[PDB]
Design a protein around this motif. Structure first.
Motif, PDB file in Angstrom:
ATOM      1  N   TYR A 217      -5.454   4.620  -7.831  1.00  0.00           N
ATOM      2  CA  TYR A 217      -5.802   4.159  -6.491  1.00  0.00           C
ATOM      3  C   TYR A 217      -6.721   5.138  -5.759  1.00  0.00           C
ATOM      4  O   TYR A 217      -7.675   4.704  -5.137  1.00  0.00           O
ATOM      5  CB  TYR A 217      -4.524   3.862  -5.693  1.00  0.00           C
ATOM      6  CG  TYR A 217      -4.752   3.432  -4.260  1.00  0.00           C
ATOM      7  CD1 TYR A 217      -4.942   4.375  -3.259  1.00  0.00           C
ATOM      8  CD2 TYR A 217      -4.748   2.086  -3.896  1.00  0.00           C
ATOM      9  CE1 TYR A 217      -5.162   3.997  -1.948  1.00  0.00           C
ATOM     10  CE2 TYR A 217      -4.963   1.694  -2.586  1.00  0.00           C
ATOM     11  CZ  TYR A 217      -5.147   2.659  -1.614  1.00  0.00           C
ATOM     12  OH  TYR A 217      -5.306   2.321  -0.299  1.00  0.00           O
ATOM     13  N   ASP A 218      -6.474   6.447  -5.865  1.00  0.00           N
ATOM     14  CA  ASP A 218      -7.282   7.461  -5.140  1.00  0.00           C
ATOM     15  C   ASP A 218      -8.737   7.565  -5.598  1.00  0.00           C
ATOM     16  O   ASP A 218      -9.641   7.827  -4.784  1.00  0.00           O
ATOM     17  CB  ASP A 218      -6.626   8.839  -5.216  1.00  0.00           C
ATOM     18  CG  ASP A 218      -5.667   9.092  -4.064  1.00  0.00           C
ATOM     19  OD1 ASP A 218      -6.135   9.461  -2.959  1.00  0.00           O
ATOM     20  OD2 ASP A 218      -4.446   8.920  -4.268  1.00  0.00           O
TER      21      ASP A 218
ATOM     22  N   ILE B 138       2.249   1.600  -3.688  1.00  0.00           N
ATOM     23  CA  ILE B 138       1.278   2.244  -4.554  1.00  0.00           C
ATOM     24  C   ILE B 138       1.324   3.782  -4.445  1.00  0.00           C
ATOM     25  O   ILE B 138       1.388   4.478  -5.463  1.00  0.00           O
ATOM     26  CB  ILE B 138      -0.146   1.681  -4.242  1.00  0.00           C
ATOM     27  CG1 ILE B 138      -0.307   0.299  -4.886  1.00  0.00           C
ATOM     28  CG2 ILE B 138      -1.266   2.605  -4.704  1.00  0.00           C
ATOM     29  CD1 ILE B 138      -1.451  -0.500  -4.309  1.00  0.00           C
TER      30      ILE B 138
ATOM     31  N   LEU C  52     -10.630   4.959  -6.840  1.00  0.00           N
ATOM     32  CA  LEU C  52     -11.359   3.703  -6.666  1.00  0.00           C
ATOM     33  C   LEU C  52     -12.020   3.639  -5.293  1.00  0.00           C
ATOM     34  O   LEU C  52     -11.469   4.116  -4.320  1.00  0.00           O
ATOM     35  CB  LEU C  52     -10.404   2.507  -6.845  1.00  0.00           C
ATOM     36  CG  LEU C  52      -9.585   2.397  -8.155  1.00  0.00           C
ATOM     37  CD1 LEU C  52      -8.584   1.250  -8.132  1.00  0.00           C
ATOM     38  CD2 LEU C  52     -10.459   2.287  -9.398  1.00  0.00           C
TER      39      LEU C  52
ATOM     40  N   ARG D 180     -12.226  -1.937  -5.145  1.00  0.00           N
ATOM     41  CA  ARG D 180     -11.322  -1.929  -6.283  1.00  0.00           C
ATOM     42  C   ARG D 180      -9.897  -1.648  -5.861  1.00  0.00           C
ATOM     43  O   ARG D 180      -8.950  -2.232  -6.419  1.00  0.00           O
ATOM     44  CB  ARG D 180     -11.823  -0.981  -7.351  1.00  0.00           C
ATOM     45  CG  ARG D 180     -13.138  -1.466  -7.950  1.00  0.00           C
ATOM     46  CD  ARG D 180     -13.667  -0.505  -8.985  1.00  0.00           C
ATOM     47  NE  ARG D 180     -14.599  -1.125  -9.909  1.00  0.00           N
ATOM     48  CZ  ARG D 180     -15.919  -1.151  -9.750  1.00  0.00           C
ATOM     49  NH1 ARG D 180     -16.496  -0.650  -8.658  1.00  0.00           N
ATOM     50  NH2 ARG D 180     -16.669  -1.711 -10.687  1.00  0.00           N
ATOM     51  N   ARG D 181      -9.731  -0.858  -4.812  1.00  0.00           N
ATOM     52  CA  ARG D 181      -8.384  -0.622  -4.268  1.00  0.00           C
ATOM     53  C   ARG D 181      -7.737  -1.926  -3.822  1.00  0.00           C
ATOM     54  O   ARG D 181      -6.589  -2.217  -4.183  1.00  0.00           O
ATOM     55  CB  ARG D 181      -8.428   0.365  -3.112  1.00  0.00           C
ATOM     56  CG  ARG D 181      -8.820   1.775  -3.555  1.00  0.00           C
ATOM     57  CD  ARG D 181      -8.317   2.836  -2.594  1.00  0.00           C
ATOM     58  NE  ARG D 181      -9.391   3.698  -2.116  1.00  0.00           N
ATOM     59  CZ  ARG D 181      -9.337   5.028  -2.036  1.00  0.00           C
ATOM     60  NH1 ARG D 181      -8.255   5.704  -2.400  1.00  0.00           N
ATOM     61  NH2 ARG D 181     -10.387   5.699  -1.576  1.00  0.00           N
TER      62      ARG D 181
ATOM     63  N   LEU E  20      -6.266  -3.765  -6.573  1.00  0.00           N
ATOM     64  CA  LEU E  20      -5.002  -3.215  -7.063  1.00  0.00           C
ATOM     65  C   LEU E  20      -3.876  -3.572  -6.112  1.00  0.00           C
ATOM     66  O   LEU E  20      -2.795  -4.011  -6.529  1.00  0.00           O
ATOM     67  CB  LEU E  20      -5.117  -1.685  -7.232  1.00  0.00           C
ATOM     68  CG  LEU E  20      -3.941  -0.912  -7.831  1.00  0.00           C
ATOM     69  CD1 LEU E  20      -3.641  -1.367  -9.245  1.00  0.00           C
ATOM     70  CD2 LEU E  20      -4.196   0.592  -7.802  1.00  0.00           C
ATOM     71  N   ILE E  21      -4.167  -3.483  -4.820  1.00  0.00           N
ATOM     72  CA  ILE E  21      -3.208  -3.883  -3.792  1.00  0.00           C
ATOM     73  C   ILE E  21      -2.854  -5.343  -3.965  1.00  0.00           C
ATOM     74  O   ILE E  21      -1.699  -5.737  -3.875  1.00  0.00           O
ATOM     75  CB  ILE E  21      -3.787  -3.701  -2.400  1.00  0.00           C
ATOM     76  CG1 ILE E  21      -4.043  -2.221  -2.124  1.00  0.00           C
ATOM     77  CG2 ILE E  21      -2.832  -4.290  -1.377  1.00  0.00           C
ATOM     78  CD1 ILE E  21      -4.871  -1.973  -0.862  1.00  0.00           C
TER      79      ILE E  21
ATOM     80  N   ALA F 118     -13.282   1.249  -2.077  1.00  0.00           N
ATOM     81  CA  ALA F 118     -12.433   0.383  -1.245  1.00  0.00           C
ATOM     82  C   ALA F 118     -12.167  -0.975  -1.909  1.00  0.00           C
ATOM     83  O   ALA F 118     -11.047  -1.508  -1.840  1.00  0.00           O
ATOM     84  CB  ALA F 118     -13.084   0.177   0.114  1.00  0.00           C
TER      85      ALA F 118
ATOM     86  N   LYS G  50      -0.969   5.778  -8.000  1.00  0.00           N
ATOM     87  CA  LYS G  50      -1.707   6.514  -6.941  1.00  0.00           C
ATOM     88  C   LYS G  50      -2.986   7.230  -7.359  1.00  0.00           C
ATOM     89  O   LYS G  50      -3.960   7.235  -6.615  1.00  0.00           O
ATOM     90  CB  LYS G  50      -0.785   7.541  -6.265  1.00  0.00           C
ATOM     91  CG  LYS G  50      -1.466   8.429  -5.231  1.00  0.00           C
ATOM     92  CD  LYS G  50      -0.510   9.479  -4.678  1.00  0.00           C
ATOM     93  CE  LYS G  50      -1.050  10.134  -3.403  1.00  0.00           C
ATOM     94  NZ  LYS G  50      -2.492  10.542  -3.453  1.00  0.00           N
TER      95      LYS G  50
ATOM     96  N   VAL H 223       0.807  -1.186   0.000  1.00  0.00           N
ATOM     97  CA  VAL H 223       0.000   0.000   0.000  1.00  0.00           C
ATOM     98  C   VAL H 223       0.856   1.258   0.000  1.00  0.00           C
ATOM     99  O   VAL H 223       0.595   2.170  -0.768  1.00  0.00           O
ATOM    100  CB  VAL H 223      -0.963   0.023   1.175  1.00  0.00           C
ATOM    101  CG1 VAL H 223      -1.690   1.368   1.232  1.00  0.00           C
ATOM    102  CG2 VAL H 223      -1.946  -1.131   1.034  1.00  0.00           C
TER     103      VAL H 223
END
Length: 253
Positions: free
Chosen positions: A88-89, A78, A91, A95-96, A99-100, A93, A85, A75
């Protein structure tokens, strides 16, 4: 459900050194030790990562420490990436977590290779991203998992990832199972006095046409006998295998 439960499913738990699907030396909950082919190299990194001579074997708690470290690394990874980032910002929770997950697997550098799908994700072009993701090398190496991550990006739901919980109602254990194919959830109330592991597992199979494999193991990965009392089973955590997936279950005390 969340990134932590999601990765447990995808990564499993192993307390001795092994070879992941790429054939790199791994331990714990998907902790990559080294990309070296040398087994001794891998044992060196293990001991360094733990702070003692492990002899290639670690405790459940040492696995969970690494795990909580690796996710935190991923995290923070990312967010030290200008490519990853802003994606990530945007998305939600769920979808994050996807990615994580992807980073965790491959990771930060390898995941910024997908300009193609990351642009699509930022724009909220979900299906398009998914189509695009299934094109990659990633999908063909570990299609099993890639499919589950991709569905998370497409839907923003936990549908590819089931869950298994234990709660007591009326002084009896109740085991609820969300299969990763479907809702609804299903629950199985049990009598610890007289029900056994095998009884529970037959109920699980009888419940769903498409379950072809059920089994229960200890944390340490030892198959638990069918005739073992539910009462004993629930004295500690256990792992439940249902088809391709293994859920780590954690009953209350």
């Amino acid at each position: 459900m969340n990134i932590f439960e999601m990765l447990r499913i995808d990564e499993g738990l192993r307390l001795k050194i092994y070879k992941n699907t790429e054939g790199y030396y791994t331990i714990g909950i998907g902790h990559l030790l080294t990309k070296s082919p040398s087994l001794n190299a891998a044992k060196s990194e293990l001991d360094k990562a733990i702070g003692r001579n492990t002899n290639g074997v670690i405790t459940k708690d040492e696995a969970e420490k690494l795990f909580n470290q690796d996710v935190d690394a991923a995290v923070r990874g990312i967010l030290r990436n200008a490519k990853l980032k802003p994606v990530y910002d945007s998305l939600d929770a769920v979808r994050r977590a996807a990615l994580i997950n992807m980073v965790f697997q491959m990771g930060e550098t390898g995941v910024a290779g997908f300009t193609n799908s990351l642009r699509m994700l930022q724009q909220k072009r979900w299906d398009e991203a998914a189509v695009n993701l299934a094109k990659s090398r990633w999908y063909n190496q570990t299609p099993n998992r890639a499919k589950r991550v991709i569905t998370t990006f497409r839907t923003g739901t936990w549908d590819a990832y089931g869950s298994v919980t234990v709660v007591y109602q009326n002084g009896l254990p109740v085991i609820s199972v969300r299969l990763p194919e479907r809702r609804e959830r299903c629950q199985f109330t049990l009598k610890p006095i007289s029900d056994s592991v095998g009884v529970f597992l037959r109920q699980l199979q009888e419940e769903d046409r498409g379950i072809d494999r059920v089994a229960i193991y200890s944390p340490d990965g030892v198959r638990v006998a069918a005739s073992t009392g539910i009462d004993l089973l629930l004295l500690d955590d256990f792992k439940l295998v249902i088809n391709d997936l293994t859920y780590h279950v954690r009953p209350p005390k």
